[PDB]
Design an enzyme around this catalytic site. Structure first.
Site, PDB file in Angstrom:
ATOM      1  CD  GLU A  39      70.073  22.928  92.029  1.00  0.00           C
ATOM      2  OE1 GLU A  39      69.353  22.725  91.033  1.00  0.00           O
ATOM      3  OE2 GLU A  39      70.145  24.037  92.605  1.00  0.00           O
TER       4      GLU A  39
ATOM      5  CE1 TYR B 267      62.692  24.523  98.181  1.00  0.00           C
ATOM      6  CE2 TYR B 267      61.160  24.458  96.338  1.00  0.00           C
ATOM      7  CZ  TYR B 267      61.589  23.971  97.561  1.00  0.00           C
ATOM      8  OH  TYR B 267      60.928  22.929  98.178  1.00  0.00           O
TER       9      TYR B 267
ATOM     10  CG  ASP C 126      64.337   3.825  99.552  1.00  0.00           C
ATOM     11  OD1 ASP C 126      64.479   4.669 100.460  1.00  0.00           O
ATOM     12  OD2 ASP C 126      64.135   2.614  99.774  1.00  0.00           O
ATOM     13  CG  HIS C 127      64.733   3.807  94.149  1.00  0.00           C
ATOM     14  ND1 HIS C 127      66.099   3.637  94.082  1.00  0.00           N
ATOM     15  CD2 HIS C 127      64.263   2.790  94.911  1.00  0.00           C
ATOM     16  CE1 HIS C 127      66.443   2.571  94.780  1.00  0.00           C
ATOM     17  NE2 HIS C 127      65.349   2.037  95.293  1.00  0.00           N
TER      18      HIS C 127
ATOM     19  CG  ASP D 227      57.106  20.493  86.293  1.00  0.00           C
ATOM     20  OD1 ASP D 227      56.879  19.839  85.251  1.00  0.00           O
ATOM     21  OD2 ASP D 227      58.257  20.851  86.630  1.00  0.00           O
TER      22      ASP D 227
ATOM     23  CG  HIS E   4      78.215 -11.979  89.735  1.00  0.00           C
ATOM     24  ND1 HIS E   4      77.922 -13.327  89.782  1.00  0.00           N
ATOM     25  CD2 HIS E   4      79.458 -11.886  89.201  1.00  0.00           C
ATOM     26  CE1 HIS E   4      78.937 -14.016  89.290  1.00  0.00           C
ATOM     27  NE2 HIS E   4      79.881 -13.165  88.929  1.00  0.00           N
TER      28      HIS E   4
HETATM   29  C1  LIG Z   1      61.083  16.858  93.963  1.00  0.00           C
HETATM   30  C2  LIG Z   1      61.809  15.715  93.284  1.00  0.00           C
HETATM   31  C3  LIG Z   1      63.332  15.869  93.152  1.00  0.00           C
HETATM   32  C4  LIG Z   1      63.910  14.851  92.170  1.00  0.00           C
HETATM   33  O1  LIG Z   1      65.299  15.061  92.002  1.00  0.00           O
HETATM   34  N1  LIG Z   1      63.919  15.761  94.488  1.00  0.00           N
HETATM   35  C5  LIG Z   1      63.815  14.712  95.305  1.00  0.00           C
HETATM   36  N2  LIG Z   1      64.303  13.527  94.874  1.00  0.00           N
HETATM   37  C6  LIG Z   1      64.222  12.450  95.682  1.00  0.00           C
HETATM   38  N3  LIG Z   1      64.696  11.219  95.335  1.00  0.00           N
HETATM   39  C7  LIG Z   1      66.007  10.689  95.389  1.00  0.00           C
HETATM   40  C8  LIG Z   1      67.022  10.944  94.470  1.00  0.00           C
HETATM   41  C9  LIG Z   1      68.262  10.357  94.633  1.00  0.00           C
HETATM   42  C10 LIG Z   1      68.528   9.506  95.701  1.00  0.00           C
HETATM   43  C11 LIG Z   1      69.859   8.874  95.888  1.00  0.00           C
HETATM   44  C12 LIG Z   1      71.030   9.442  95.395  1.00  0.00           C
HETATM   45  C13 LIG Z   1      72.240   8.818  95.614  1.00  0.00           C
HETATM   46  C14 LIG Z   1      72.260   7.642  96.317  1.00  0.00           C
HETATM   47  C15 LIG Z   1      71.067   7.125  96.768  1.00  0.00           C
HETATM   48  N4  LIG Z   1      69.877   7.711  96.571  1.00  0.00           N
HETATM   49  C16 LIG Z   1      67.506   9.262  96.607  1.00  0.00           C
HETATM   50  C17 LIG Z   1      66.263   9.838  96.461  1.00  0.00           C
HETATM   51  C18 LIG Z   1      63.538  12.589  96.905  1.00  0.00           C
HETATM   52  N5  LIG Z   1      63.261  11.692  97.928  1.00  0.00           N
HETATM   53  C19 LIG Z   1      62.619  12.427  98.810  1.00  0.00           C
HETATM   54  N6  LIG Z   1      62.464  13.740  98.455  1.00  0.00           N
HETATM   55  C20 LIG Z   1      61.787  14.827  99.197  1.00  0.00           C
HETATM   56  C21 LIG Z   1      62.680  16.036  99.299  1.00  0.00           C
HETATM   57  C22 LIG Z   1      60.442  15.120  98.558  1.00  0.00           C
HETATM   58  C23 LIG Z   1      63.049  13.844  97.218  1.00  0.00           C
HETATM   59  N7  LIG Z   1      63.145  14.934  96.450  1.00  0.00           N
END
Ligand SMILES: CC[C@H](CO)Nc1nc(Nc2ccc(-c3ccccn3)cc2)c2ncn(C(C)C)c2n1
Lengths: 248, 327, 826
Positions: free
Chosen positions: B21, B24, B103-104, B145, B326
């Site tokens: 989330e 904005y 990915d993370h 930030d 595991h």
């Molecule tokens: C501005 C940072 C903000 C942090 O929350 N948002 C955000 N977080 C990202 N990481 C994320 C989080 C969770 C999962 C996930 C969840 C469930 C299962 C598998 N993977 C994967 C990637 C991300 N990766 C590309 N972007 C672009 C929009 C810049 C991102 N933006």
């Protein structure tokens, strides 16, 4: 990657406005009035010169893709200035722009805003952003006028006269389609070239290359005089058409 | 052409799901049907229409179309919801900002118990982050930030800065009043906790230093709930703000009002004695109280710790993918 | 918000450590056995152990040591918890009244520090001048044992050697001296330092840094006359005392890693060693006395005594009885005889103390139709592997079914009057090119047997070299009778095939009931498995028939029956299969937004997904469309060990940090953003690792059974054996019970003076949050054990709220009944 924002003078014969039966003089008049509207409104609100110019550039670009007969110009202008404030971090509330627009416009002119001025302006933002292709960053002749002037060394008073005269020429060019024909760097040089000719100054003497008679080539590469002459000619046309004269 | 943004439909992407989330709008993971590329769409809604298109998004569009660096996340394009036609006034659809999918996130990886970062892993991590900050800082843009949620990681080991929603241009010749609360409390710099109205690029360096220490402890250094408590924690480690180390601390509005329990002595080197010597100097320099005495991004790259790191010999982060399943 | 209740049905049974000393009286010999959060005190008899006292502590017991400072008549006890709560305890008895005194206490946590790989180590000086603690890399913490240090204030000495394996205080030194083994890039070394309380730093140590075996694991401080230290490795035992260097490398110990050590003869002549295959050794220090009267260590010798349970801790009772404390198996009292028996063993078992051990999985099944329900657990590991049948009857009645191999998953198939169990056994690469099992076990002692002949991965062309002596896992499906628990059948999976998931169900329009196993091809080279099988078996007429097989490109970690369809977790993908009229699995739909879909649960058309780091995600199957849809995800990142569905809106999870949390749908549907945000409404530190959540109750349910305010029954199993129940509560009952907790915590005296609110707080290395949404049942059920004055003190000013209820005032006698009604559930 990035969009191309420059047309040839010949291409302006084919704007949507022209092709809907608007003649060249009328579209030119509409552009001056819209630009000056943006300029005057923002000046009353205390806005930075870059914010005014950004709105004007959005405006000029807008009417390369749309017709003045389907988009009332003063609504568009107000929308441009509204967005320009958010882009250049000099934000204003839409209701304050409307307030000022009403103060400056007569009753007929404010008719363009319809029954709900704020909504008509706020709605257009969606079209404006799509039209300018979300390319919000804009450079203006002002920064180059100063960057180049800073490299001139000589009589403090003759150079300051050159800058202010050129600065005025920049403000006046916002009423024209030069913003759509030549990059800002060239505009800054052209206004330096013009202010120089009128003040009977020989700018090369102030450069690090005083025997390089084409003084601008060290600032802007690949600019022929013909380009500079056209820009200068177009600027002075506004003064001759109007009652106003060269600042000197 | 590739440059005509805002027209293409969100239909071209299939929404895998909501990954996070955003301030904005919520962020969704998605796949381009045409290319198969995995992209992350940040939902921007002008439907509220309180004051039009959000400025947080406007900053991120304005800045990230200008910034091209491997350690900066790339906005690929902007797409629109299938919009109403012939009714430009009735259109209340949304706009989506396409990003590369990572990915993370750094916080999530550290929150998992055993993402172990070796010295050479941290070298590759911090070098990329500071190179990106150096790139942004040479362009006079301040990513205010900086937190663990904003640093994003690919399994390749590529590190990218991400949320530029709070970034503004900084002029050294012309100071302008700025928003007082610009960084998350845990990673906030001391001058902003004392109410600095004219933030410097060094505020970002302080945050990156908090991260540097965090990567060696797996725990944030300054965890507090209130601005005063945070100043106390910083003071317990770095020393209490005093004119002898920060001559202009007296000019900051809240200096007299906000005092630590004691005028503490700096213990940073003592409490971080387990850190390699090359890194400890980096931490000491980044966590300098006076922003004018705090090292810059370029200086961090010209350090014994990061100077000779080669990104070509990238070291993948710990991959505990199968033993952890595991135990 | 959500309101839930957690109660402990069976206490932790695994032994985490054991010491012997003179704790209850300067005269008696005591054995203090520590299980997670529980301390047991025994007195040694000629027959066995006499229990005297048991206390709980609000913390996991990490360090337990007995010492006797000058001026004390009897030993004092130091216990340090895993949350760094330190305390010194004293036993005091006034006739029939036994209580535990908190002499000193405090929390020794540092604001900044890196937790060490080899964990918390605690040692005490032979002169009881100080307590040494190794909590963080690069730091040694000293609590000086002065009379005035009632708060256990301490200081840190910088330690150059960042990676320490083990440390002990040495005997026979002019100053307090530490001997430790450390690891740097050049290998492992043994080094010494002296500890100066006056200077608060290390000084040069008495003897040189020998570099030691690469896998040197344990340090033994040998008392005078020998002095110095012994270093235990994988292949060699070495003794270092200044100039002395000794090395015995008997081939017998290379076979199995040695994990424990204990001193037999107070003078250091004899020590006990135990290894992971259960062997018990005697380490003999051969003495030679020179003319000058000096005693020198002539040689080190190792003699095999026999076999015990895999020992986590060893402790010798002076009577010649050795207590075997096992985390992986049943604990024991064994006797060391001077003469061997006819099999060559000197070890004969005396008593066996039941340990549920590692509970890898469990199922609740009503075998007798009593309606009560029984809990069948996969318990233990390696040679200690077993099934346990558990039923209420006031104590729990537990039947043990030895397997001698590791059980992994269990599921009940009623149609066949039997269980299906997945198991793995250890074989070793032998000189034939194949492998040989170290001992016979369930998968080899089956009545009938089969081996997969699948050709799916037979194309190979991928080389995997084998070295003699390396271990391998061999995985099997066991068919076990529900009355006799005889291994009717054993099916052995492919070489390098790991069986990870098992279900028993009918699919589609197929009337046959099948055993379905999900497997993964595990090769040392692959960080993540890239091959796998879903295998459909039928158990019919004493034979297991391979019905169908589906190849998948990943590991099938978890599978569950879903409305006649099969749900699968293949690495990142979550898949729904259909069972065709041709008896083959057919894919209907997929979901890919998961790093790893480790755990899966279903209710109706809803699916709960547990990820390695992405916490919980609530999916839904949309039948109109034929695909999945993401309903809501928990955005806070948590490491999952097990998940369960409480009701349509509340979801329960377990963290690898020994924490429990509950997530709910936001149910504030103004925006799609809110619906999708599962909100963690409950946080609780259980203190145990939850492997399995299972719906059901062991209570003897009968027509008209005593009913309770608590609703629902989710039972959970832990690695230390604890079995617990999670249940739902109404808002009114929570508030009552919670307000009572706060009152009980002011009244009840904690061992070590540990605040209860701290103990149950959510805790990871990165976060600490106050508990929410959970009632500690054990605290509530301790109201019935506090004295009458304390009960009435608790009920002072007790009022009911929100109307539609009883009279606000509550007495002690009213509450005694309410708690007893609550004790019916467990
Ligand atoms: C501005 C940072 C903000 C942090 O929350 N948002 C955000 N977080 C990202 N990481 C994320 C989080 C969770 C999962 C996930 C969840 C469930 C299962 C598998 N993977 C994967 C990637 C991300 N990766 C590309 N972007 C672009 C929009 C810049 C991102 N933006």
């Amino acid at each position: 990657t990035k969009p191309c924002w420059y047309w040839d003078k010949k291409d302006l014969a084919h704007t949507p406005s022209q092709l809907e039966g608007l003649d060249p003089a009328t579209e030119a008049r509409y552009r001056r009035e819209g630009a000056r509207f943006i300029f005057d409104v923002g000046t009353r609100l205390g806005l930075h010169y870059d914010t005014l110019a950004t709105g004007i550039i959005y405006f000029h670009r807008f009417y390369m893709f749309h017709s003045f007969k389907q988009f009332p110009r003063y609504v568009t202008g107000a929308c441009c200035l509204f967005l320009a404030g958010k882009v250049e971090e000099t934000p204003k509330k839409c209701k304050d722009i409307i307030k000022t627009a009403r103060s400056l416009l007569n009753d007929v002119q404010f008719g363009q805003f319809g029954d709900d001025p704020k909504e008509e302006v706020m709605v257009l933002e969606r079209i404006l952003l799509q039209t300018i292709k979300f390319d919000l960053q804009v450079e203006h002749p002002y920064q180059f006028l100063l960057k180049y002037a800073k490299q001139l060394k000589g009589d403090k008073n003759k150079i300051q006269k050159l800058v202010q005269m050129a600065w005025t020429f920049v403000n006046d060019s916002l009423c024209t389609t030069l913003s759509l024909q030549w990059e800002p760097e060239i505009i800054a040089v052209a206004v330096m070239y013009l202010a120089g000719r009128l003040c009977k100054f020989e700018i090369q003497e102030w450069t690090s290359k005083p025997m390089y008679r084409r003084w601008w080539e060290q600032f802007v590469q690949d600019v022929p005089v013909d380009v500079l002459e056209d820009i200068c000619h177009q600027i002075l046309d506004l003064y001759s058409q109007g009652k106003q004269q060269m600042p000197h | 052409t590739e440059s005509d943004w805002g027209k293409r439909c969100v239909d071209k992407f299939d929404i895998i799901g909501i990954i996070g989330e955003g301030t904005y709008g919520q962020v969704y993971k998605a796949k381009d049907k045409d290319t198969g590329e995995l992209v992350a769409l940040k939902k921007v809604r002008l439907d509220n229409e309180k004051e039009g298109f959000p400025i947080t998004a406007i900053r991120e569009i304005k800045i990230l179309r200008q910034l091209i660096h491997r350690s900066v996340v790339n906005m690929k394009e902007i797409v629109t919801d299938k919009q109403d036609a012939l009714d430009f006034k009735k259109d209340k659809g949304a706009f989506y900002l396409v990003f590369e999918y990572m990915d993370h996130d750094l916080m999530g990886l550290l929150e998992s118990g055993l993402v172990h970062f070796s010295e050479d892993h941290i070298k590759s991590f911090m070098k990329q982050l500071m190179e990106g900050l150096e790139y942004c800082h040479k362009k006079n843009f301040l990513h205010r930030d900086i937190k663990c949620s904003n640093i994003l990681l690919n399994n390749s080991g590529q590190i990218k800065l991400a949320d530029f929603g709070l970034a503004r241009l900084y002029n050294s010749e012309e100071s302008r009043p700025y928003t007082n609360k610009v960084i998350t409390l845990w990673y906030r710099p001391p001058e902003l906790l004392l109410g600095e109205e004219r933030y410097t690029p060094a505020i970002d360096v302080w945050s990156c230093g908090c991260i540097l220490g965090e990567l060696f402890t797996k725990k944030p250094i300054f965890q507090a709930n209130l601005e005063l408590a945070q100043l106390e924690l910083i003071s317990r480690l770095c020393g209490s703000p005093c004119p002898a180390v920060w001559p202009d601390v007296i000019r900051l509005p809240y200096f007299n009002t906000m005092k630590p329990k004691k005028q503490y002595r700096r213990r940073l080197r003592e409490e971080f004695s387990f850190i390699p010597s090359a890194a400890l100097d980096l931490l000491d320099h980044m966590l300098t109280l006076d922003p004018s005495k705090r090292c810059t991004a370029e200086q961090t790259l010209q350090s014994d710790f990061l100077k000779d790191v080669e990104l070509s010999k990238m070291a993948p982060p710990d991959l505990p993918h199968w033993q952890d399943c595991h135990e | 918000m959500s309101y839930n209740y957690v109660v402990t049905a069976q206490k932790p049974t695994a032994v985490n450590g054991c010491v012997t000393g003179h704790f209850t009286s300067a005269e008696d010999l005591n054995l203090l056995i520590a299980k997670n959060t529980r301390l047991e005190i025994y007195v040694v008899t000629a027959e066995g152990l006499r229990p005297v006292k048991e206390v709980g502590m609000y913390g996991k017991i990490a360090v337990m040591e007995l010492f006797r400072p000058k001026g004390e008549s009897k030993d004092l006890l130091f216990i340090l918890t895993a949350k760094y709560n330190a305390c010194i305890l004293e036993y005091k008895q006034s006739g029939e009244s036994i209580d535990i005194i908190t002499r000193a206490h405090g929390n020794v946590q540092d604001r900044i520090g890196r937790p060490s790989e080899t964990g918390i180590i605690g040692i005490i000086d032979p002169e009881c001048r100080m307590i040494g603690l190794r909590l963080y890399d690069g730091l040694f913490k000293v609590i000086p044992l002065d009379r005035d240090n009632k708060e256990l204030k301490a200081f840190n000495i910088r330690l150059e050697e960042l990676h320490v394996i083990d440390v002990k205080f040495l005997y026979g030194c002019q100053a307090p001296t530490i001997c430790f083994v450390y690891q740097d890039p050049q290998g492992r070394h043994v080094k010494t330092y002296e500890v100066s309380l006056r200077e608060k730093e290390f000084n040069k140590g008495p003897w040189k840094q020998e570099n030691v075996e690469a896998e040197a694991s344990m340090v033994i401080a040998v008392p005078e006359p020998f002095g110095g230290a012994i270093i235990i490795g994988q292949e060699s035992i070495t003794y270092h005392n200044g100039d002395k260097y000794l090395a015995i490398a008997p081939p017998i110990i290379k076979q199995s890693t040695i994990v424990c050590h204990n001193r037999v003869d107070p003078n250091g002549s004899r020590y006990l060693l135990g290894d992971m295959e259960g062997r018990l050794f005697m380490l003999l220090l051969e003495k030679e006395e020179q003319m000058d009267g000096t005693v020198t260590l002539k040689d080190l010798r190792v003699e095999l005594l026999g076999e015990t349970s895999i020992a986590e801790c060893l402790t010798y009772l002076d009577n010649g009885v050795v207590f075997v404390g096992s985390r992986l198996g049943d604990s024991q009292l064994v006797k060391l005889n001077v003469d061997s028996n006819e099999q060559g063993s000197y070890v004969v078992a005396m008593e066996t103390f039941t340990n549920l051990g590692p509970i890898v999985d469990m199922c609740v099944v009503d075998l007798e139709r009593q309606g009560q329900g029984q809990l069948v657990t996969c318990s233990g590991a390696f040679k200690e592997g077993s099934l346990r049948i558990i039923r209420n009857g006031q104590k729990l009645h537990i039947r043990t079914v030895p397997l001698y191999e590791s059980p992994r998953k269990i599921c009940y198939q009623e149609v066949s009057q039997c269980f299906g169990v997945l198991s793995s056994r250890i074989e070793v690469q032998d000189t034939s090119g194949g492998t040989t099992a170290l001992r016979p076990s369930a998968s080899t002692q089956a009545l009938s047997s089969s081996v997969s002949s699948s050709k799916l991965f037979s194309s190979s062309t991928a080389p995997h070299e084998t070295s003699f002596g390396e271990e391998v896992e061999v995985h099997n499906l066991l068919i076990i009778d529900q009355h006799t628990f005889e291994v009717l059948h054993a099916h052995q999976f492919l070489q390098n095939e790991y069986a990870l998931s098992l279900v028993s169900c009918k699919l589609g329009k197929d009337p046959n009931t099948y055993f379905i196993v999900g497997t993964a091809m595990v090769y040392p080279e692959e960080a993540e498995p890239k091959q796998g099988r879903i295998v459909v078996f039928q158990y019919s007429d004493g034979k297991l028939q391979t019905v169908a097989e589906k190849e998948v490109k990943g590991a099938v970690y978890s599978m569950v029956e879903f409305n006649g369809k099969l749900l699968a977790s293949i690495n990142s993908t979550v898949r729904l299969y259909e069972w065709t009229t041709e008896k083959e699995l057919r894919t209907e739909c997929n979901h890919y937004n998961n790093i790893m879909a480790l755990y899966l649960k279903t209710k109706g058309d809803f699916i709960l997904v547990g990820d390695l780091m992405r916490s919980v995600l609530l999916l839904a199957y949309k039948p109109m469309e034929g695909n999945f849809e993401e309903i809501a995800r928990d955005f806070n990142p948590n490491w999952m060990s097990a998940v369960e569905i409480l009701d349509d809106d509340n979801f329960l999870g377990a963290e690898n940090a020994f924490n429990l949390f509950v997530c709910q749908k936001d149910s504030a549907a103004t925006t799609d953003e809110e619906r999708q945000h599962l909100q963690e409404v409950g946080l609780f530190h259980l203190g145990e690792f939850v492997n399995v959540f299972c719906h059901g109750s062991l209570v003897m349910q009968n027509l008209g059974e005593t009913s309770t305010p608590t609703q629902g029954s989710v039972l959970f199993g832990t690695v230390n054996g604890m079995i617990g129940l999670v249940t739902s509560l109404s808002e009114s009952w929570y508030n009552l019970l919670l307000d009572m907790q706060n009152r009980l915590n002011k009244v009840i005296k904690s061992v070590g003076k540990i605040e209860h609110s701290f103990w149950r707080s959510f805790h990871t290395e990165r976060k600490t949050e106050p508990a929410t949404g959970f009632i500690d049942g054990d605290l509530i059920e301790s109201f019935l054990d506090i004295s009458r004055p304390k009960m009435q003190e608790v009920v002072a000013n007790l009022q009911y709220d929100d109307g539609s209820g009883m009279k606000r005032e509550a007495t002690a006698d009213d509450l005694i009944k309410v708690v007893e009604e609550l004790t019916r559930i467990h």
